[PDB]
Amino acid sequence: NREEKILNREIGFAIGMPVCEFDMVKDPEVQDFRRNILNVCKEAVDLRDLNSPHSRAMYVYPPNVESSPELPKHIYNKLDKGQIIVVIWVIVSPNNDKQKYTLKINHDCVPEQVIAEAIRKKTRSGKYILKVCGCDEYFLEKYPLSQYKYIRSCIMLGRMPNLMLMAKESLYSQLPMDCFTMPSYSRRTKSLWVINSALRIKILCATYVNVNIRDIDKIYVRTGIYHGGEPLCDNVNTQRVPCSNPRWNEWLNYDIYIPDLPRAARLCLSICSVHCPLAWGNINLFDYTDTLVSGKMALNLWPVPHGLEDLLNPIGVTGSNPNKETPCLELEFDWFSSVVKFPDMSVIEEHANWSVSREAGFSYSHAGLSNRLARDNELRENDKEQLKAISTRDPLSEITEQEKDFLWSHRHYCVTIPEILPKLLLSVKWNSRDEVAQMYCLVKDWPPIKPEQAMELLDCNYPDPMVRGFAVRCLEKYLTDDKLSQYLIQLVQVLKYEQYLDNLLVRFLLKKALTNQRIGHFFFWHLKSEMHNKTVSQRFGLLLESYCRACGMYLKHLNRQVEAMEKLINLTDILKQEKKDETQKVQMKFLVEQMRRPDFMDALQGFLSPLNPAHQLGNLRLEECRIMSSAKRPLWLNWENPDIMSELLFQNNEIIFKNGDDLRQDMLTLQIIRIMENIWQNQGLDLRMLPYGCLSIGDCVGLIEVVRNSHTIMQIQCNSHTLHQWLKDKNKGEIYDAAIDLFTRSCAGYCVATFILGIGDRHNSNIMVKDDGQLFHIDFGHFLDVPFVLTQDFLIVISKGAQECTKTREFERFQEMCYKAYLAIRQHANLFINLFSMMLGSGMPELQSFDDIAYIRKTLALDKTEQEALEYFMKQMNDA
Numbered sequence: 001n002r003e004e005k006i007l008n009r010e011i012g013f014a015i016g017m018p019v020c021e022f023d024m025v026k027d028p029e030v031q032d033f034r035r036n037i038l039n040v041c042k043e044a045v046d047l048r049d050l051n052s053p054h055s056r057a058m059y060v061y062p063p064n065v066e067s068s069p070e071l072p073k074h075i076y077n078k079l080d081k082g083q084i085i086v087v088i089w090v091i092v093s094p095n096n097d098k099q100k101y102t103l104k105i106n107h108d109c110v111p112e113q114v115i116a117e118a119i120r121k122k123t124r125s126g127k128y129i130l131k132v133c134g135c136d137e138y139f140l141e142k143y144p145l146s147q148y149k150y151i152r153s154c155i156m157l158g159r160m161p162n163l164m165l166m167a168k169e170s171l172y173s174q175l176p177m178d179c180f181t182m183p184s185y186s187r188r189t190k191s192l193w194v195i196n197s198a199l200r201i202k203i204l205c206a207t208y209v210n211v212n213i214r215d216i217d218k219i220y221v222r223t224g225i226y227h228g229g230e231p232l233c234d235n236v237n238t239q240r241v242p243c244s245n246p247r248w249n250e251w252l253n254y255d256i257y258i259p260d261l262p263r264a265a266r267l268c269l270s271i272c273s274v275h276c277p278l279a280w281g282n283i284n285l286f287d288y289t290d291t292l293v294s295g296k297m298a299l300n301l302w303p304v305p306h307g308l309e310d311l312l313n314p315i316g317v318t319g320s321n322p323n324k325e326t327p328c329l330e331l332e333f334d335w336f337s338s339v340v341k342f343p344d345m346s347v348i349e350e351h352a353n354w355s356v357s358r359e360a361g362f363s364y365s366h367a368g369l370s371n372r373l374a375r376d377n378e379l380r381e382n383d384k385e386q387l388k389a390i391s392t393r394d395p396l397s398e399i400t401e402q403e404k405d406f407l408w409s410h411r412h413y414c415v416t417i418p419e420i421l422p423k424l425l426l427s428v429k430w431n432s433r434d435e436v437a438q439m440y441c442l443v444k445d446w447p448p449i450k451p452e453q454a455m456e457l458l459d460c461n462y463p464d465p466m467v468r469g470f471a472v473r474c475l476e477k478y479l480t481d482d483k484l485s486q487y488l489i490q491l492v493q494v495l496k497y498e499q500y501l502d503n504l505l506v507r508f509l510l511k512k513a514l515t516n517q518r519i520g521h522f523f524f525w526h527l528k529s530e531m532h533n534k535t536v537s538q539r540f541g542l543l544l545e546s547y548c549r550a551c552g553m554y555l556k557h558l559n560r561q562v563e564a565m566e567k568l569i570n571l572t573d574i575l576k577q578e579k580k581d582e583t584q585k586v587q588m589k590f591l592v593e594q595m596r597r598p599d600f601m602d603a604l605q606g607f608l609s610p611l612n613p614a615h616q617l618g619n620l621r622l623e624e625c626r627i628m629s630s631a632k633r634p635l636w637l638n639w640e641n642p643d644i645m646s647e648l649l650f651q652n653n654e655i656i657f658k659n660g661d662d663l664r665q666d667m668l669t670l671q672i673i674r675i676m677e678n679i680w681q682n683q684g685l686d687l688r689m690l691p692y693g694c695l696s697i698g699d700c701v702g703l704i705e706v707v708r709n710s711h712t713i714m715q716i717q718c719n720s721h722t723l724h725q726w727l728k729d730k731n732k733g734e735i736y737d738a739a740i741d742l743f744t745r746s747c748a749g750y751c752v753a754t755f756i757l758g759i760g761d762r763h764n765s766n767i768m769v770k771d772d773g774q775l776f777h778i779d780f781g782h783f784l785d786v787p788f789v790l791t792q793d794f795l796i797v798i799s800k801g802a803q804e805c806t807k808t809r810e811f812e813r814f815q816e817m818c819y820k821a822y823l824a825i826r827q828h829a830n831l832f833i834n835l836f837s838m839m840l841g842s843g844m845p846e847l848q849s850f851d852d853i854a855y856i857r858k859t860l861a862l863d864k865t866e867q868e869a870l871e872y873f874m875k876q877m878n879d880a
Contacts, residue, residue: 004183011548014524014559016531017541023185025538029288033501033542035186040507041550044514045180048552053172054140060175060554061138062518067482069147071107071155072684078155082106084146086161088118089133089645096644107146107155111139118165129171133162134641134649135614138171156681156688162648178552190338191347192292193259193433199225200253202332203238206246206271209278209327216273219243221329223269225254225285226314227262228463232431235312240274258292261285262430263342264463264499268314270301271327277304277311279327282318288500292340294333301327302535307848315460315841317496317535345440352437371402374409383410391420394862395456395833396850399423408435411442418447422456425467436464443470451479455487456834458494458505460841465499472504481516486678488519489671490838492526495543496536497841506543514550521613523547524558525697532699533843560607564617565697567603568635571595572659575633587627595622605639611693611703615653618642624652632660636706654706655693661781663702664844666694669757669780672832676753676825683824687749687817688742690776709771712778713764713793723769724797730771739773744798744810746775748817751790755876756825756859760786783846784855788876815877822873826860833857 008019022034048059076082086103101121105114111130119128130139132150145151154161203221211219219242224235233255238248263286270280279301285293300321305313343351359375367376387410390403399407404427407414414420421443428439443466448454454474457467475484484491495506513523524547527540548555571594579587594600601620609615617639624638635657641650674691681687693705716726731739754762754777761782769775775794795805798814805811825832836853846852861869 001184004181007181007549010555010559011545014548014555014562015528015541015544016562017537019545022542022545029501030538030542031188032288034545035188036502037507037510037543037546038182038186038549040511041180041514041546042182044511045178045550047515048178052177053175056175056177056552057138057171058140059515059552060517061136061140061171062481062516063139063141063143064137064149064518065141065143065147065482066149066152067480069108069144071146072682074684074686075146075152075155075681078158079107084151084155084161086114086145086151086163088114088130089162089164089648090118090122091164091644105145107151108144110142111145112142114145114163115165127169128165128167131164131166131171132614132649133164133645134643134647135612136616136643137614139163156686162645164645176553178550180550180552183549189341190336191259191343192261192340193343193347193351195258195336195340197258197334197336198253199256199258199261200251200334201267202251203248203269204250204330204332205248206330207328208325209243209246209271211243211273211278213243216243218274219246219278220272220274221248221269222272222277222311223252223267224312224314225256226266226268226312227264227430228461229314230430230461231314232256232262232265256431260431260433261292262433262436263290263465266314266318266463266499267331268312269299269329270312271329272311277308279303280308280313280316281320281329282314282316283331284318284499286342288502290342292333292336292342294335294340296330296332298328298330300324301329305843307845317841318499322534322538348437348440349444351433352441355434355438371405372408374406375412377409379410379413384413387414387420388417390423391417393423394829394857395422395837396853396857397862399426403427411439415442415446418449419453421446421449422453422462425457425462425464430464440466443467446470448474448477451475451483451487452831452834455490455494455838456830458491458497459834459837460497463497463499465503468498469504472508476508481512481519484512484516485519485522486671486675487835488522489526489668490835492523493842494838495539501539501542510543510546513547517551517554518613520547520551520554521610522695524551525610525695528562529696529698529702535843557608557613561610563603564607565610565701567600568657569659569698569701571600572633572635572657575627576659580633584627584629587633591625591627592622595620595625609653609655609703610697611655611695611705616642617653621652624654628656632658634658634704650708654708656704656706657702658704659701662700662845663694663696663704664842665783665846666704666780667696667702668839668844668847669759669783670694672757672835673753675831675835677749679824679828680749680821683820685817685820685824687745687752687821688774689746689749689753690774692776707768707770707776710768710774710776712766712768716769717764720792720796721801723793724801727769727773727797731773740797740800741773743769743773743775743794744814745817746773747794747798748814748821750775750777751788752818752821752825755786755788756822756856757783758785758855758859759783762789784852787879790877790880818877819870819873823866823870826862826866826869829856829860829862 012018048056083104084107088101088103090099091097092099101118103117105117114130115128137150139148146155151161218240220240221238222235225232236252236254238250241248265285267283267285271278281299281301283299287293302316302321362376364376367373407424407427411424414424429435451474454471457471462468491509498505513520527544531537531540575587579590605618605620607617609617619640621638621640626636628634628636637655637657639653641653670691673689677689677691690707692707696702713723716723727739727743728736766779767775767777799805799808799810802808833853836847839847861872
């Protein structure tokens with residue numbers, strides 16, 4: 001058709017990849033994915049069409065609400081007699097005439113109740129909705145007004161809520177309807193258990209294996225069978241062969257029997273020199289149709305990632321390298337006269353139910369022969385008490401083989417403490433179909449666990465699809481849209497661990513992206529920002545294709561953002577190329593020259609901010625745009641806020657564009673800070689952090705939010721009393737007390753957060769202070785390594801200029817904030833551990849092994865008691 005060719009052009013421009021390149025791939029998994037995923041698209045579109053048009057406005061403008069309607073004490077105490085003061089704005093004439101009506105109402109009022117009170121005091125002389133003044137956020141559901149994050153924050157900050165009445169007809173008429181069309185491209189045996197053979201694989205020859213004859217005599221193929229990074233048997237190598245003729249023609253035998261192969265079994269192989277590795281690759285032993293791979297097949301290998309001292313790379317992704325001009329290794333698997341598939345769930349349930357009756361046969365005498373079969377043995381309360389103690393340890397405490405045998409034995413009891421499932425799963429012998437079949441039935445009826453606990457089951461050491469299917473069940477039952485957005489970074493990353501294109505995790509995330517457009521925005525950009533990475537570009541490219549067909553009109557607004565970013569990349573590439581050594585003035589002349597060409601001049605104005613799509617980026621104030629003093633030439637960009645009420649929120653939107661630095665680390669560290677702030681605010685501990693906008697949009701390219709009215713400590717010094725005098729100066733009179741209080745709280749938060757996270761390299765140019773006293777750190781490149789950090793400059797401010805701070809009462813109140821903030825994060829240690837664990841396959845440099853993560857066990861003292869952990873942080877703080 002004709003409309004389909006335009007839509008494919010729009011999809012291709014958004015992804016940076018022509019749709020026809022997807023059509024060219026003859027891998028049937030690819031084509032099946034492109035068709036089979038389309039039911040998620042129709043379900044999502046139908047969810048947006050049931051109860052139109054309010055259904056599609058919910059989609060485009062979801063409520064921005066907190067997790068729970070309950071308010072902490074320090075929040076409620078902001079509100080005398082449970083009453084909030086809210087200003088409601090109405091425009092009487094089409095000339096944008098302002099009329100404010102101030103209201104005093106209960107915080108739990110639905111937006112309809114706030115419209116009623118506003119319309120009654122409008123007349124003192126069901127057709128409207130509330131909009132946040134200054135940005136495209138709406139209050140469409142019947143949430144308690146205090147539960148919306150904007151209203152909650154206005155209570156938190158002691159700032160005045162500014163809202164606007166707007167008729168429903170206004171918003172609805174500006175939301176175009178979605179005409180999702182199904183595309184022209186959707187319309188297109190013996191079990192393993194009955195095979196008693198040992199596994200053997202044929203390593204025949206290798207091509208494109210050019211390598212320097214210097215320091216190379218012989219080369220050889222190292223293989224290994226793994227299940228999620230743990231070997232199922234011994235690694236078997238091939239025999240050394242000459243470098244000029246890479247032929248082995250060798251069948252390798254492995255200590256594992258075929259019916260015991262787990263579903264997620266993978267062949268991890270590599271080519272190694274003689275005694276270093278050259279290139280690696282992984283193959284799934286089963287395809288996406290549950291078929292034991294049989295026959296000849298060739299694998300294009302991957303270059304060794306810098307830092308890989310091992311010989312195999314079992315955590316790297318699986319599949320052939322798309323660059324077919326790389327080392328290519330040829331393999332052959334046994335055919336067994338028939339198509340071999342993995343047994344049905346009914347066959348597994350039979351074998352497992354059979355296996356439980358074999359237990360009651362064996363009785364108590366036989367139970368002695370195996371420590372893992374302690375089911376028949378009677379269980380003292382010590383056993384129940386040890387299982388409880390095991391279930392309460394962090395996801396990275398070592399589980400001994402005694403404990404693993406102890407866990408398998410009591411699995412019918414572990415169902416009663418479902419939080420122990422992760423450690424239980426780690427106790428299975430995954431190379432025993434007898435045990436695994438029996439674990440499946442446990443997982444089949446396992447009680448749901450918290451989303452924060454289930455996310456662990458999606459990282460790099462739970463590859464089994466039944467384990468991961470249970471994990472998605474949990475998120476799909478308890479994970480709120482708020483928490484989904486909060487954790488979206490990690491949930492996108494764990495898609496890389498998935499063994500196949502079509503899988504329950506991606507169907508979950510895609511459906512939520514296509515029913516919640518705040519989520520779909522960052523879903524898009526987190527995927528788009530890594531299309532340059534060839535290990536996942538095809539995976540994310542196909543997933544982006546299906547998204548762009550069903551997200552609706554927002555595809556047009558996304559392309560609008562993509563070309564904006566693309567012009568900024570091209571323009572900054574030309575600066576780093578042709579004017580990199582010129583003065584900043586010569587660079588600015590060239591910048592203003594390039595920016596005033598007509599094609600560029602609208603590509604970058606009249607689009608939505610990728611940092612926050614509620615923010616509209618109107619006209620560009622070139623007079624306020626500058627190349628920044630930093631290296632890599634950051635662009636200070638300034639747009640007009642075209643909103644009618646821009647003066648009540650922010651009149652200019654200031655964003656830094658940075659080309660050259662990997663921003664994934666800043667984006668992650670600020671996520672952790674935001675979550676830590678959320679934990680502290682829920683426990684009534686008002687420690688004000690500033691998790692500040694930072695989005696990676698591509699390979700060492702991204703956007704950074706500007707916080708206004710802030711200065712670095714180094715500039716403020718331009719005496720240890722110097723900082724405090726600046727704060728006294730900026731904050732005279734009654735403001736002094738609130739300002740000192742704001743600095744002490746923000747300092748406590750960042751002291752604790754930087755200590756826990758091992759945030760080193762902190763100097764007076766990495767710590768800024770706002771005019772209202774808000775301290776906050778910056779440039780989070782390095783992290784997880786450093787001791788507790790408190791300069792004398794900070795302490796003088798806390799004690800309001802006193803000589804000894806330890807002596808004053810304010811330092812006592814400062815410490816209790818830290819100890820409480822420290823113990824609050826420690827009580828949520830599993831959350832942060834799992835979040836970092838999910839980031840291991842990301843390819844991020846500073847999160848590549850569990851050794852990198854072990855440092856938060858040390859700073860949080862998880863192997864000690866909450867007493868002795870507090871004393872450790874008692875000491876770490878007084879060490880100054």
